[PDB]
Amino acid sequence: FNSVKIGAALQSIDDWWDEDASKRLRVHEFGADKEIGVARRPPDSEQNFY
Amino acid sequence: FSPKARAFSDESLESYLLRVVSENFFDSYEGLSLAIREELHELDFEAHGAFPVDLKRLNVYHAKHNSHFRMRALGLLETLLDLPRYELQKLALLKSDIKFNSSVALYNNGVDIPLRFIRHHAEEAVDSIPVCSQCLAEEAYIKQSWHIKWVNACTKHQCALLHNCPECYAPINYIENESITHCSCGFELSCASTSPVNTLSIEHLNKLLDKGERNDSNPLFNNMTLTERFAALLWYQERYSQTDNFCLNDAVNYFSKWPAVFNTELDELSKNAEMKLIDLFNKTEFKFIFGDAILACPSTQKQSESHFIYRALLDYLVTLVESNPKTKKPNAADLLVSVLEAATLLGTSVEQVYRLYQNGILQTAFRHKMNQRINPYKGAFFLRHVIEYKTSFGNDKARMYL
Amino acid sequence: FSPKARAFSDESLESYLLRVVSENFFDSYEGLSLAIREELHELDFEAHGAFPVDLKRLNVYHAKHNSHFRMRALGLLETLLDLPRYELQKLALLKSDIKFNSSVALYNNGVDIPLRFIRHHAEEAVDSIPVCSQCLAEEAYIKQSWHIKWVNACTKHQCALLHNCPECYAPINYIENESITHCSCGFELSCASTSPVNTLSIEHLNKLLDKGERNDSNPLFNNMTLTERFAALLWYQERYSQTDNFCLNDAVNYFSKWPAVFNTELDELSKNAEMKLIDLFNKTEFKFIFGDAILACPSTQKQSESHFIYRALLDYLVTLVESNPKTKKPNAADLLVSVLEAATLLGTSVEQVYRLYQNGILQTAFRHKMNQRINPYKGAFFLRHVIEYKTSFGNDKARMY
């Protein structure tokens, strides 16, 4: 495995985006979900990193 | 001028206005029309510009561009001819946004009709608005029910409607002739003789024009409102290409056996699905195998009250994914469904189904690459989990309880 | 593994599953859960991803984003545990699109409930699902009725429900403890003693959970279906800020005098309308004077069957325009009504009322200027001719006949 991939596994903890979160996301600045392919903390929202 | 004749419950606007000029203050409708044109021109130029001289294009649904001005002209007509307020506006055949599957509709008191089913629409070079003769014998006026193409015999007199003149054999049109009681050909004697009835066909049509409550053997004449009863007839026509056919007895005998006729039609499409395949099931669209059978279905925009046709279609698709479990070989339950076909199966607006795509609730079936905005007709989602999403929402007549 | 116990009429999903693992077999629910997780993982990865290990988040309404996959998992669970089809799916508390005035709802067999009225929703740090003791004595299972916050007593016995442990005084929760019959605190002996009843409060609650037909003195327990009987209770709470209060007897005594209590509450707002004015009547909105009373009203999106609260409200507004005749001076019938408040008073969709604005059937207060699309909350139409438009359409219980 790439180091980045193991990293992506360890840092798969983000379930704070909603109260009943279906999964734990890899920590992203816009809460990007790779499998589904749309942001869970979009730039329009107040829950993105910035 | 003050007309003393007053509108009936179901009298048409042309019928009442011809019965106004039937009083011998004016010789013809044109004389009255030019006189009110002058009086509108002296009052208001816009309402004058709206008000047409002929009786042809006087109904509100004809005027696409000056409907608001037409109502203003009609309202001034009521004010000017010594009539109460709204008197002409209740007889009007008003506009309607509701589309009968990309077919513009027309509003009468409580009931919206597809514009194909109207007789006097568009003005076909020579057409007939058919007349109950011994119905004119009691009172000389035109009911709104005779303008519908399905109505051929009704009802208190129990007699077939008269289409053509007994002298010339020219079709009877009270708009063209400007005469309710008389023909242009003469009609010198009283109302002519009739072919009686099939006798059981009348209790079919009397079940149609009954308003909004009561059940029976036939799903068409079951607990429904009249506007959706027409929706079922329009669906029936375009399925078998009965566009010019307007025989009521050819529909009610068909819909009497409803569940069995549509299941067996959909069963052969499932058995012969593998035959038609140019590509794999997970790459082929739904309309490639089944053909138009989802987006032709009557819409459930009303109340969130589902159509009996819609309840019968979906309940077949629920048992399709039941028989086709989720294995590594793709099967009939991996057919691609578009956002409009998805919108109908959920029974919601198309923006609401895009918003489910926006929050990744419903998962497309291939990834668009960043500037791909989904084509509304291109098959996006699988039939599979679009149904499972619909079985996550419980309604009373699910097969789970029994 | 093949469980032989079968679901009752009103048994919960958790109750039935705990009664499956009550067969010895598996030691705990977790052991069963991990064993089915393994078998789903070998079958279908998507259904494996959906199926949770805990009993906490197993009901369908908890899954906002993987409902379709949850149903799949549940269907595979039926297929895998030697059960008939739909066996788990009839006990599920399913999703519902109907909003109880911006409150998400939940679906049980026939009935849709506001999510505020569920006990086990959201998982409050420490909460109790209360238990009829001598009801467990007959058969050890949890009814779906005990998950509703309005239900505090049995009939199945005519006794008050037990909330806390008789040893520790710790709240009884059969989800947290994974035990229907026993407490975590022990419950070493048989089912404990009870406070009996007020005795007339039971025929109140028995009238509530009766389905959909029969009339009486009280408009609440009158000819209505259970889903609207909850709508009335939610309307009652937010009017008097009884959000945390769930006493059933405080509502039924209120609704017993229904027409008199709501008229006199609306009479002082009409008499003291001139007192509150910052502008003229033809410029001020309806919610400035009367306050939220129209949009809080239970919606008539069902059947075109009007609510008894909705029938009482509008019948006051009909006699308001009766006492306020159309004079040059503006009066209490010239209050501005917005398109959502207009949509409720007509009892149709909001697009349908925009379309009446499109053709110019309903007319605005002061005309727009070329780019103004109407703000749905800004008061557009007068209260006045919106009523006269509604009186143009004749329904059976009008005051005319």
- Say how many CA atoms lie within 13 Å of C30 toward its Cβ: 4
Q: For residue B9, what are the contacts with CB-CB under 8 A and spacing of at least 6?
A: none
Own/partner contacts of B323-330, CB < 8 Å, gap of 24 or more, are B326/B384, B326/C44, B326/C47, B326/C72, B330/B280, B330/B281, B330/B282
Please indicate whether, in this complex, the C-beta atoms of C107 and B401 are within 8 angstroms of each other: no
Please indicate whether, in this complex, the C-beta atoms of A22 and C66 are within 8 angstroms of each other: yes
C-beta separation of C88 from C77 below 8 A: yes
> Using beta carbons and an 8 Å cutoff, which residues of C are at the interface with A?
49, 57, 62-66, 122
Residue C176's region, left for phi above 0, alpha for psi from -120 to 50, else beta, is alpha
Sole residue written with tokens 């009523």: C387
d(CA B155, CA B196): 11
- Taking only Cα atoms into account, the Rg of chain B, rounded to an integer number of angstroms, comes to 26
Q: For residue B19, what are the contacts with CB-CB under 8 A and spacing of at least 6?
A: B5, B140, B141, B180
Q: For residue A9, what are the contacts with CB-CB under 8 A and spacing of at least 6?
A: none
Largest interatomic CA distance in chain B: 84
Cβ-based burial of C367 (10 A; exposed 0-12, middle 13-18, buried ≥19): exposed
Which run of H or of E encompasses B350?
Answer: helix B350-358
Instruction: From B283, B220, B15, select the one nearest B136 (Cα to Cα).
Output: B15
Q: Which residues, in sequence order, are bridge partners of residue A33?
A: A38
* Buried residues in B353-390 as b, exposed as e (16+ CB within 10 A): bbebbeebbbbbeeeeeeeeeeeeeebbbbbbbbbbbb
Could you tell me the two tokens for C291?
A: 């306050």
Cβ-based burial of B103 (10 A; exposed 0-12, middle 13-18, buried ≥19): middle
Sole residue written with tokens 């960043």: B370
Could you tell me the two tokens for B240?
A: 């078998």
Distance from first CA to last CA of chain C, Å, rounded? 69
C-beta separation of B338 from B365 below 8 A: no
* Buried residues in C303-320 as b, exposed as e (16+ CB within 10 A): eeebbbbbebbbebbeeb
CA atoms B379, B382, B386, B391: torsion sign: positive
Q: How many other CB atoms sit within 10 Å of the CB of residue B28?
A: 9
Question: Which residue of chain B comes nearest to C84, CA vs CA?
Answer: B400
Instruction: From B379, B282, B270, B279, select the one nearest B334 (Cα to Cα).
Output: B282
How many helices (H) and strands (E) chain B has is answered by 14, 5
Position C297: which residue type?
C
Instruction: From C125, C122, C129, select the one nearest C164 (Cα to Cα).
Output: C129
Residues in chain C: 401
Q: For residue C7, what are the contacts with CB-CB under 8 A and spacing of at least 6?
A: C16, C87, C90, C91
Which run of H or of E encompasses B382?
Answer: strand B381-382
d(CA B111, CA B226): 7
Q: How many other CB atoms sit within 10 Å of the CB of residue B108?
A: 20
Phi then psi dihedrals of residue C311, to 5 deg:
-65, -40
Instruction: From B30, B38, B19, B109, select the one nearest B76 (Cα to Cα).
Output: B38
Could you tell me the two tokens for B329?
A: 């070989």
Instruction: From C293, C242, C230, select the one nearest C98 (Cα to Cα).
Output: C230
**Chain B CB contacts of A17 below 8 Å:** none
Give SS3 for C369. Answer: coil
> Any CB–CB contact under 8 A between A35 and chain C?
no
Please indicate whether, in this complex, the C-beta atoms of A22 and C64 are within 8 angstroms of each other: yes
Give SS3 for B112. Answer: strand
**How far is C-alpha A19 from the geometric centre of its chain's CA atoms?**
14
Identity of the residue in C44, C97, C109 whose CB atom sits nearest the CB atom of B393: C97
Cβ-based burial of B394 (10 A; exposed 0-12, middle 13-18, buried ≥19): buried
Q: For residue B53, what are the contacts with CB-CB under 8 A and spacing of at least 6?
A: B30, B33, B34, B37
Q: How many other CB atoms sit within 10 Å of the CB of residue C172?
A: 22
3-state secondary structure C179-217: CCCCCCCCCCCCCCCCCCCCCCHHHHHHHHCCCCCCCCC
Give the gap in angstroms from C-alpha A37 to the nearest C-alpha of chain B: 8
Q: Which residues, in sequence order, are bridge partners of residue C148?
A: C118
* Buried residues in B181-211 as b, exposed as e (16+ CB within 10 A): eebeeebeeebeebeeeeeebeebbebbeee
Please indicate whether, in this complex, the C-beta atoms of B392 and C109 are within 8 angstroms of each other: no
Give the gap in angstroms from C-alpha A36 to the nearest C-alpha of chain B: 6
Distance from first CA to last CA of chain A, Å, rounded? 31
Where do the H-state alpha helices sit in C81-169? Answer: 133-136
Sole residue written with tokens 């033809």: C282
* Buried residues in C81-90 as b, exposed as e (16+ CB within 10 A): bebeebbbbb
Q: Which residues, in sequence order, are bridge partners of residue C107?
A: C94, C112
> Any CB–CB contact under 8 A between A30 and chain B?
no
C-beta separation of C157 from C146 below 8 A: no
> Using beta carbons and an 8 Å cutoff, which residues of B are at the interface with C?
67-68, 71, 86, 94-95, 97, 303-305, 322, 326, 348, 359-361, 385-386, 388-389, 391-396, 399-401
* Buried residues in C258-283 as b, exposed as e (16+ CB within 10 A): beeebeeeeeeeeeebeeeeeeebeb
Q: What is the resolution of this structure in A?
A: 2.6
Please indicate whether, in this complex, the C-beta atoms of C94 and B401 are within 8 angstroms of each other: no
d(CA C224, CA C311): 14
Position C309: which residue type?
I
Own/partner contacts of B207-212, CB < 8 Å, gap of 24 or more, are B208/B150, B208/B248, B209/B145, B209/B151, B209/B154, B211/B110
Please indicate whether, in this complex, the C-beta atoms of A22 and C122 are within 8 angstroms of each other: no
C-beta separation of C90 from C7 below 8 A: yes
Q: Beta A25-26 vs C336-337: how paired, if at all?
A: unpaired
Give the gap in angstroms from C-alpha B393 to the nearest C-alpha of chain C: 5
d(CA C306, CA C301): 9
d(CA B381, CA C137): 51
Please indicate whether, in this complex, the C-beta atoms of B358 and A38 are within 8 angstroms of each other: yes
C-beta separation of C175 from C57 below 8 A: no
* Buried residues in C6-24 as b, exposed as e (16+ CB within 10 A): ebbeebbbbbbbbbbbbee
The DSSP secondary-structure symbol of C60 reads: G
Give SS3 for B205. Answer: helix
d(CA C138, CA C160): 16
Could you tell me the two tokens for C97?
A: 């699109």
C-beta separation of B233 from B190 below 8 A: no
Strand arrangement of the beta sheet that strand C111-114 belongs to? C94-99, C104-108, C111-114
Q: For residue B2, what are the contacts with CB-CB under 8 A and spacing of at least 6?
A: B81, B82
Best mutation target among A33, A38, A44 (most B Cβ atoms within 10 Å) is A38
**Chain B CB contacts of C60 below 8 Å:** 392
d(CA B43, CA B66): 18
Give the gap in angstroms from C-alpha A2 to the nearest C-alpha of chain B: 24
C-beta separation of B34 from B8 below 8 A: no
Question: Which residue of chain B comes nearest to A41, CA vs CA?
Answer: B359
**Chain A CB contacts of B360 below 8 Å:** 33, 36-38, 40
C-beta separation of B127 from B120 below 8 A: yes
Position C114: which residue type?
P
Q: How many other CB atoms sit within 10 Å of the CB of residue C169?
A: 9
Phi then psi dihedrals of residue C250, to 5 deg:
-75, -15
C-beta separation of B161 from B152 below 8 A: yes
Give SS3 for B263. Answer: helix
Instruction: From C229, C280, C275, select the one nearest C255 (Cα to Cα).
Output: C229
Sole residue written with tokens 């509100």: B60
d(CA B379, CA B357): 14
**How far is C-alpha C13 from the geometric centre of its chain's CA atoms?**
20
Q: For residue B256, what are the contacts with CB-CB under 8 A and spacing of at least 6?
A: B217, B218
Q: Which residues, in sequence order, are bridge partners of residue A21?
A: none
Instruction: From B312, B376, B388, B377, select the one nearest B346 (Cα to Cα).
Output: B388
Give the gap in angstroms from C-alpha B95 to the nearest C-alpha of chain C: 8
Q: Beta B94-99 vs B104-108: how paired, if at all?
A: antiparallel
CA distances, C191 to each of C140, C218, C256 (Å): 11, 36, 37
CA distances, C395 to each of B9, B249, C392 (Å): 16, 34, 10
> Any CB–CB contact under 8 A between A15 and chain B?
no
Instruction: From B367, B360, C119, B385, select the one nearest A18 (Cα to Cα).
Output: B360
Instruction: From B208, B129, B112, select the one nearest B173 (Cα to Cα).
Output: B129
d(CA B233, CA B226): 11
From which experimental method does this structure derive? cryo-EM
Position B228: which residue type?
E
Instruction: From C295, C314, C292, C302, select the one nearest C389 (Cα to Cα).
Output: C314
Give SS3 for C42. Answer: helix
C-beta separation of C383 from C334 below 8 A: yes
Which run of H or of E encompasses A12?
Answer: strand A12-14
Please indicate whether, in this complex, the C-beta atoms of A18 and C122 are within 8 angstroms of each other: no
Q: Where are the beta strands (DSSP E) in B93-237?
A: 94-99, 104-108, 111-114
Please indicate whether, in this complex, the C-beta atoms of C64 and A20 are within 8 angstroms of each other: yes
Distance from first CA to last CA of chain B, Å, rounded? 69
Instruction: From B192, B111, B208, select the one nearest B154 (Cα to Cα).
Output: B208
Could you tell me the two tokens for A22?
A: 């279906």
C-beta separation of B82 from B2 below 8 A: yes
C-beta separation of B158 from B197 below 8 A: yes
Could you tell me the two tokens for C47?
A: 């259904």
DSSP codes, B241-307: T-SS---THHHHHHHTTHHHHHHHHHHHHHHTTTTS-SS-TTTSBSTTTT-STTTSSPP--STT---
Please indicate whether, in this complex, the C-beta atoms of B359 and A38 are within 8 angstroms of each other: yes
Instruction: From B28, B5, B26, B1, select the one nearest B16 (Cα to Cα).
Output: B5
Best mutation target among B356, B359, B361, B374 (most A Cβ atoms within 10 Å) is B359
**Chain A CB contacts of C65 below 8 Å:** 22
- Taking only Cα atoms into account, the Rg of chain A, rounded to an integer number of angstroms, comes to 11
> Any CB–CB contact under 8 A between A44 and chain C?
no
Could you tell me the two tokens for C212?
A: 């959909």
> Any CB–CB contact under 8 A between A23 and chain C?
yes
C-beta separation of B149 from B122 below 8 A: no
d(CA B397, CA B62): 42
Q: For residue B178, what are the contacts with CB-CB under 8 A and spacing of at least 6?
A: B18, B21, B28, B29, B55
Q: Where are the beta strands (DSSP E) in C236-378?
A: 336-337
Question: Which residue of chain B comes nearest to A22, CA vs CA?
Answer: B361
Phi then psi dihedrals of residue B104, to 5 deg:
-60, 140
Give the gap in angstroms from C-alpha B363 to the nearest C-alpha of chain A: 7
C-beta separation of B116 from B167 below 8 A: no
Sole residue written with tokens 């194909």: B116
Best mutation target among C42, C72, C90 (most B Cβ atoms within 10 Å) is C72
C-beta separation of B172 from B182 below 8 A: no
Instruction: From C385, C381, C394, C372, select the one nearest C341 (Cα to Cα).
Output: C381
Residue B98's region, left for phi above 0, alpha for psi from -120 to 50, else beta, is beta
Which run of H or of E encompasses C249?
Answer: helix C249-255
Could you tell me the two tokens for B116?
A: 């194909």
d(CA C47, CA C69): 5
Give SS3 for B108. Answer: strand
Position B199: which residue type?
T
Please indicate whether, in this complex, the C-beta atoms of A38 and B360 are within 8 angstroms of each other: yes
C-beta separation of B22 from B141 below 8 A: no
CA distances, B221 to each of B153, B209, B212, B247 (Å): 18, 10, 10, 16
Question: Which residue of chain B comes nearest to C44, CA vs CA?
Answer: B326
**How far is C-alpha B123 from the geometric centre of its chain's CA atoms?**
18
d(CA B159, CA B161): 7
C-beta separation of B360 from A33 below 8 A: yes
Q: Which residues, in sequence order, are bridge partners of residue C326?
A: none
Could you tell me the two tokens for B271?
A: 């058995």
Q: Torsion angle of alpha carbons B172, B177, B179, B180, nearest 10°?
A: 30
Instruction: From B352, B383, B199, B366, select the one nearest B290 (Cα to Cα).
Output: B383
The DSSP secondary-structure symbol of C221 reads: T
Q: Is the peptide bond before B319 cis (omega within 30 degrees of 0)?
A: no
C-beta separation of C332 from C273 below 8 A: yes
Give SS3 for C72. Answer: helix
CB pairs under 8 A between B and C: 70
